[PDB]
C-alpha cells in the first residue's frame, strides 16, 4: 500500500543491522496502523495479514539474532493475528512452522506445562500428515520418555528444513537437565556408564560440572555425598508446636463456650 | 443447574441408540452369571479373569507337567 | 477487542513511549474484560509510574488504580486514584468512578475522624486533590443541596466551613437548624 | 374419531390444576411470605424455587398441546392490576377471567402473541409496589415454557425473550442493585437465564457479548456479596472457557480470588468438576484425584447417576496415569456401565501394559473416546504404558535383569533399561538405590510404612488437619442450632 517492502523481504539478509532500520521502520509505519486487530471494513485483512507476515519473518530474524524478549514480543504480537475471531483469515503456510518453533520455545524455556495445556488447539487437522506438524509433540513424547538416544539417532531424520540447528538449541538447552538428572546421584554412579550417557570426548562436562556441581572427583568414579545423611529432630520444637496445638484446641473447643 | 444434564443425556440417548439392546442382552449374557454376585469381587475375578482370558487360564492342569520339566 | 493478547504486555514492557501510550489507551478498553491479564504487568506499570521519566502519571495510575480494586485492596487502588495527580474526569454513572470516589469519600471522612480528635500537634497531611474531588462531587450535590445530606455529610466530614455554605442558600432556615440539631443530638 | 375424540378433553384437565396451584402456591407463598419484611426473611424460597425448577425439569408438559390447548399461553398472572388499593373487585376478576374460558371455548393460538408481553410491564407488572419481585416472579417462570422447544425457529423467539429480559430487568436493572431476597434470587435467576439461552449462544454464536458484559455484571455486585450467584455466573464463564480458552494468565489462579462461601449443595460439585477439568490438563496426581473424586461423591440429591459419568470418566482417565486404576466397584447403575463399555478393554489393558497389541487396541475400536477430541491424554497414555508397567516393576522386585525383566518390559538393551528405570528414578515417587558393583543395578525398594518409622512427625499433621476438620464440623453443629433457636 504505502510502499513495496518486498525487495529486502525475501532477500535473506545475513546482516540484521540493515534489518534493524527496516524493522523499526515498520514499527514507525505500523505505529499508526492499529496493531490491534481491526474488523472494520474487512478489506484491511490485506495489510494486517502482510503485517502479520513481516512480523513473522521479522520474528525469524529475531531468533536468527537470538533475542529472547524480542522473541516473546513478536510471538505475543503474532498470536493476536493468529488468534482472531474471523476465520476468513487464510492460514499461513509458515504458521505451523512458527507455531512449531513456539513449541520449541516452550520446551526451551521449560514452560512445558503451558505447552501441555496448549496441546488442545494444535491438532486442528489442517495438515497432520507433514512430519513437522507431528514433530515437536513427538519430540516431547520422547521427552516424557526422556529417550535422547532416539532423538540423537533422530538428528538426521529431520529433512533439509533449516531448523535442525534450532533443534540443536533445544538439545543444548536440555542437557543441563538430562546431565543434572543423570548426575542426581542418589547412592553413587560410575564413570564408565557416563562415558556413553555423557557426551563426546571433549571433557566439557567434567570441566564445567566441576565448577557447577563442585563435588569430589575420585579415582575414576563419580561420588555422591549429602545423600540421606540428615540427623532426625530433637522432638522438642515439635513438642512446642504441639503445645501450641493444645492451646488452639482449648481455643477452638472453648472460645464462645 | 442440572439442565446441563440434558445435553449429556442427549449424548446418552445417542449412546443407547448406537446399539439397541444388543449390549444389554449380550452383556446380560455375562450379567446372568454376574447378577447378585457382589461386583467388588467381580472386579478381582474380572481382573485375574481378564488377565488369564488371554493365556494360562486354568493352568493348574499344566503344573503337574511343570514338575518334571521345572 | 482482544481477550488473550499478550503483545500488549510486551509493548507495555517496551521503551520509546509513543508506542506505549496508545497501547495503554487500547488497554483501557479491554481492562474490564481482563484485569487479570494485566496482573502480571502490574509491576511494570508501577515502575513506569514511580519514576517521573514517563510523562503521564495518571495514564499509569489510572490503569493501576483500576486493576487493583479488581485484584486486591481498595487502599492500593485508592493511592493511585488519589495519587494520579491532576485527573480530568467528568461525573459518570460507571461503577469504577463511583467506587473510587466512594472509597475516597469513606476514607476521607475516615481521615477526618482520625484528625477530628487531634486538633493540634502531629497533624497528618491530607492531599489537596482529595479535598477537591470530595468537595467537587459534594458541591455537585450542593447545586440544590437535595435538602438533606449537606448537613449530614457536613457533620460526617468533621470540617468547619463545610456547613456555612449550606445554610447560605437554605430554605426554611429554622427547619434547617432544627433538622440540624435533630441530627446532631441523635449521633 | 371416537378413540381420541372421546379421550381428548379428559387427560388434559390435569396439569392445569397442579401448575395453577403451583404458581398460586409459590407466587402467593413468596409474596404472601416475604411481603411485610422481605429483608428480614431471606432465602426461604431459594430451595423452594429451585426444587420447583428441578421438579419441572422432567415435565412431559407439551406433547399434544399445539392443537387447541394453547389458551394457557395468552393468560398470565393478572393479579391486582391497574390500582394498588381497592383490589376486591379484582378478587372477583380472578375467578371471572378463569371462568370466561370455561363456558364454551376460547379463540386460541400459539405463535402470534409473544411480542406484546410488555403491555403490563410498561405501566404495572402486578401492583406498582412490588414490581421487582412480581416482575421476575411473573416473567421468569413462563419464559422457559414458551421458549421450550428451542429448535424450529424459537431461537429467534428466544432472542426476543432475551431482549425482553434485559429490557425490563437485566440491561442494568430497574434499581441497579435491588439488595433484597429478589436481588439474591436475581443472581441465579439471571444466571439460569444465561444458561438457558447459552444453548442458543453456542448453537450458532460463541463468546462475544453478554458473556463479555457478565464480567461487569459480575463485579457490579460491589464485592460485598456472599458471591453464591457470582460464583454461578463464574461457572458459565468457566464452561465457556472449557471448549477453547487454554490461556492461564487470567482464569487459572487469577480468577482464583477469596474463594467465597459458595455452596448451593450443587455448586461445590459442578464448580469443582469444572476447575478439575481445566486442572486435569497438567495431569494433577495428588489434588484433582482426591477432590475430583470428592466432587464425584457430591450431588446425591436428584441423581448420582446421569451426570457423574463425566467426572467419573475423566476421573478414571486421570487415575490410570498413576499406575493404579480402580474400576467401577461400589456403585451399580447401568449408565456409567454403558459409559465404560468401550473403556473396559483398554482400562484393563492398562495394567498388563503390552505395547504393540494395545497400541492397536486403542485406535482399533477407537470411535468415541478418540472422537472425543485431539487424543491428548491417550497420547500421553501411549508412552505412559511402559511407565505404569515399570511402576508395577517397582511394585515387584529390586534387581533388573538384562533378559528376564528387560524382555518382559519388551525393552532389550543394557542402556535403555537403566536409562528409563532412571527416568522413573528422577520422578521421586519411588525408592531405589543406584549401584554398580559388577554392572547390575540394585535398589533397596523399601516400601516400609511409617509404623515404627518417625510416627509422631508423620501423623502429627494428620492429627492437626483431622482435628481441624472434625472441630470445624463441631462449629458446623454449633452454628446451625443457633440458626434453629434464632426464630424462637
PDB file of N, CA, C and O in Angstrom, chain B residues 4 6-7 9 12 27 41-42 44 52 60:
ATOM      1  N   UNK B   4     -27.755 -28.840  32.358  1.00  0.00           N
ATOM      2  CA  UNK B   4     -26.631 -29.301  31.563  1.00  0.00           C
ATOM      3  C   UNK B   4     -26.507 -30.810  31.605  1.00  0.00           C
ATOM      4  O   UNK B   4     -25.722 -31.382  30.844  1.00  0.00           O
ATOM      5  N   UNK B   6     -29.066 -32.313  30.572  1.00  0.00           N
ATOM      6  CA  UNK B   6     -29.882 -32.631  29.401  1.00  0.00           C
ATOM      7  C   UNK B   6     -29.080 -32.879  28.121  1.00  0.00           C
ATOM      8  O   UNK B   6     -29.380 -33.871  27.436  1.00  0.00           O
ATOM      9  N   UNK B   7     -28.091 -32.055  27.714  1.00  0.00           N
ATOM     10  CA  UNK B   7     -27.337 -32.444  26.505  1.00  0.00           C
ATOM     11  C   UNK B   7     -26.404 -33.622  26.732  1.00  0.00           C
ATOM     12  O   UNK B   7     -26.109 -34.358  25.780  1.00  0.00           O
ATOM     13  N   UNK B   9     -27.307 -36.130  28.578  1.00  0.00           N
ATOM     14  CA  UNK B   9     -28.261 -37.218  28.405  1.00  0.00           C
ATOM     15  C   UNK B   9     -28.716 -37.373  26.960  1.00  0.00           C
ATOM     16  O   UNK B   9     -29.174 -38.456  26.590  1.00  0.00           O
ATOM     17  N   UNK B  12     -26.220 -39.491  25.948  1.00  0.00           N
ATOM     18  CA  UNK B  12     -26.515 -40.831  26.443  1.00  0.00           C
ATOM     19  C   UNK B  12     -27.549 -41.537  25.588  1.00  0.00           C
ATOM     20  O   UNK B  12     -27.471 -42.753  25.389  1.00  0.00           O
ATOM     21  N   UNK B  27     -24.236 -58.406  26.941  1.00  0.00           N
ATOM     22  CA  UNK B  27     -23.606 -58.199  28.237  1.00  0.00           C
ATOM     23  C   UNK B  27     -24.442 -58.750  29.382  1.00  0.00           C
ATOM     24  O   UNK B  27     -23.893 -59.022  30.453  1.00  0.00           O
ATOM     25  N   UNK B  41     -16.151 -58.215  44.198  1.00  0.00           N
ATOM     26  CA  UNK B  41     -15.499 -59.477  43.880  1.00  0.00           C
ATOM     27  C   UNK B  41     -15.389 -59.700  42.377  1.00  0.00           C
ATOM     28  O   UNK B  41     -14.403 -60.291  41.923  1.00  0.00           O
ATOM     29  N   UNK B  42     -16.354 -59.204  41.595  1.00  0.00           N
ATOM     30  CA  UNK B  42     -16.297 -59.327  40.144  1.00  0.00           C
ATOM     31  C   UNK B  42     -15.261 -58.412  39.515  1.00  0.00           C
ATOM     32  O   UNK B  42     -14.997 -58.544  38.319  1.00  0.00           O
ATOM     33  N   UNK B  44     -12.127 -58.147  41.117  1.00  0.00           N
ATOM     34  CA  UNK B  44     -10.977 -59.022  41.307  1.00  0.00           C
ATOM     35  C   UNK B  44     -11.059 -60.234  40.394  1.00  0.00           C
ATOM     36  O   UNK B  44     -10.072 -60.597  39.737  1.00  0.00           O
ATOM     37  N   UNK B  52      -6.111 -63.685  32.695  1.00  0.00           N
ATOM     38  CA  UNK B  52      -5.850 -65.030  32.198  1.00  0.00           C
ATOM     39  C   UNK B  52      -6.810 -65.459  31.103  1.00  0.00           C
ATOM     40  O   UNK B  52      -6.730 -66.604  30.648  1.00  0.00           O
ATOM     41  N   UNK B  60      -3.558 -75.007  36.239  1.00  0.00           N
ATOM     42  CA  UNK B  60      -3.205 -75.909  37.324  1.00  0.00           C
ATOM     43  C   UNK B  60      -3.096 -77.336  36.814  1.00  0.00           C
ATOM     44  O   UNK B  60      -2.404 -78.168  37.410  1.00  0.00           O
TER      45      UNK B  60
END
